[PDB]
Design a protein around this ligand. Structure first.
Ligand SMILES: Nc1nc2ncc(CNc3ccc(C(=O)OP(=O)(O)O)cc3)nc2c(=O)[nH]1
Ligand SMILES: Nc1ncnc2c1ncn2[C@@H]1O[C@H](COP(=O)(O)OP(=O)(O)O)[C@@H](O)[C@H]1O
Ligand SMILES: [Mg+2]
Ligand SMILES: [Mg+2]
Length: 414
């Protein structure tokens, strides 16, 4: 059993093995420990963000605007690209590793004999770190689903649903309706329930009615329009024009703005512009370099692949598209690749080290074309060796693939 003085790495290895099951959805055990720790209300204002895709970037947008508005903001995000500490930001910055291990030590003593999973532990830690930080606003990214996610032990002041599509059917049910119901579990009585999914499953309205939540959805209570050079937003309180084209997915920037406006928080139009203009998240349609155009995107399900495919087709015409890909077997690899195949010319497949990582040959079979490599680094090197300046190299499929290339590039700078 690690202690406050133990390295973070030891703590993470310990958390990875503490509970009988890796993922164990449910609120009881975790709520009881949160109750002992006094971390159930981490800040006077909390945004909780659920959805199939778009959670990370919607949270980043909220963080960016609120910081511009001068609020002390904390953000809980998952999963992480390279380092675990990425999961907890205060004022847009990671916290010291020793703050994390101290928090873990507090949870370890407070839990007594109550067992907690890795994500439950990490959630309690983020909450405790936020409480210590005396923040004005805390933004919680839901881990998985909503209703039974560890983050749902906190009562959000504004609940957000970014999109509803097929992912995590093992836990959330086989269709958009079952998935929508689970995501909507973060809604609360008399609190805004901001829905950015344009094709809202009816179950989301059911849950909003069951809870007495204040549903405000895209296409109804609020909306946005786009141009090649900017965008506009509208809701019950008015309209905003010539907004900065987002550096995060367009739908999420609009969802964040809707949630921000529904919150009643005091935020100027300039803080909104500055926030949107500066909101960006590594690995989310990230333009890394040019000649050739290098793009990183963590899409890992067909809805995200379809969106990515749409962004790829919107890129300047000409040149070849070479993809460096690695994926986990727990995702709909076939459906994800079906979309990507329509835009990719040359495939460079790599295995993902793992209990759940697909091998290069497994990916190759889905493609019907392409080359296999022994590692992401080698696939990346082969693509970049083949790419001409007019081409685009897309690193995709998983957080793992993107992270591997980010690390190879950074290491080469030394
Ligand atoms: N009550 C609990 N909730 C909970 N929620 C999530 C998890 C596992 N951690 C995850 C983190 C991220 C994702 C994910 O898909 O993240 P993105 O969609 O943003 O990419 C899934 C699981 N365990 C428990 C768990 O064990 N208990
Ligand atoms: N509204 C959206 N619709 C479809 N796909 C999206 C949307 N937002 C993001 N994505 C996809 O999901 C990936 C990660 O997005 P992120 O904003 O971190 O959301 P999440 O935390 O839910 O995974 C992106 O790189 C993109 O491939
Ligand atoms: Mg997910
Ligand atoms: Mg996320």
């Amino acid at each position: 059993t690690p202690q406050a003085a133990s390295p973070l790495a030891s703590w993470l290895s310990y958390l990875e093995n503490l509970h009988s099951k890796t993922i164990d959805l449910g609120l009881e055990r975790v709520s009881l420990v949160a109750a002992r720790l006094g971390v159930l209300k981490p800040a006077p204002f909390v945004f909780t963000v659920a959805g199939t895709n778009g959670k990370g970037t919607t949270c980043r947008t909220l963080e960016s605007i609120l910081m511009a508005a001068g609020y002390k903001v904390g953000v809980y995000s998952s999963p992480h690209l390279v380092r675990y500490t990425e999961r907890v930001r205060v004022q847009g910055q990671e916290l010291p590793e020793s703050a994390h291990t101290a928090s873990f030590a507090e949870i370890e003593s407070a839990r007594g004999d109550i067992s907690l999973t890795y994500f439950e532990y990490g959630t309690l830690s983020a909450l405790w770190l936020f409480k210590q930080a005396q923040l004005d606003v805390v933004i919680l990214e839901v881990g998985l689903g909503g209703r039974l996610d560890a983050t749902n032990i906190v009562d959000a002041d504004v609940a957000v649903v970014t999109s509803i599509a097929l992912d995590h059917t093992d836990w959330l049910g086989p269709d958009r309706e079952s998935i929508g119901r689970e995501k909507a579990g973060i809604f609360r009585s008399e609190k805004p329930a901001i829905v950015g999914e344009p094709e809202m499953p009816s179950t989301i309205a059911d849950v909003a009615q069951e809870k007495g939540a204040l549903l405000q959805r895209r296409g109804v209570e609020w909306n946005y329009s786009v141009t090649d050079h900017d965008w506009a937003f509208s809701d019950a309180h008015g309209t905003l024009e010539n907004l900065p084209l987002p550096l995060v997915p367009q739908p999420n920037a609009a969802t964040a703005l809707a949630a921000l406006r529904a919150s009643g928080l005091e935020v100027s139009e300039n803080a909104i512009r500055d926030g949107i203009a500066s909101a960006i998240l590594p690995g989310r349609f990230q333009i890394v370099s040019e000649s050739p155009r290098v793009i990183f995107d963590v899409a890992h399900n067909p809805h995200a692949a379809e969106y990515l495919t749409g962004r790829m087709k919107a890129l300047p015409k000409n040149g070849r598209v070479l993809a460096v890909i690695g994926m986990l077997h727990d995702k709909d690899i076939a459906g994800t690749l079906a979309w990507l195949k329509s835009v990719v010319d040359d495939w460079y497949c790599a295995p993902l080290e793992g209990p759940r990582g697909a091998t290069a040959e497994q990916l190759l079979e889905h493609l019907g074309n392409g080359k296999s490599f022994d590692s992401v680094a080698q696939a990346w090197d082969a693509a970049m060796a083949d790419a001409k300046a007019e081409d685009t190299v897309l690193v995709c499929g998983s957080f793992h693939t993107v992270a591997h290339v980010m690390e190879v590039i950074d290491a080469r700078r030394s």
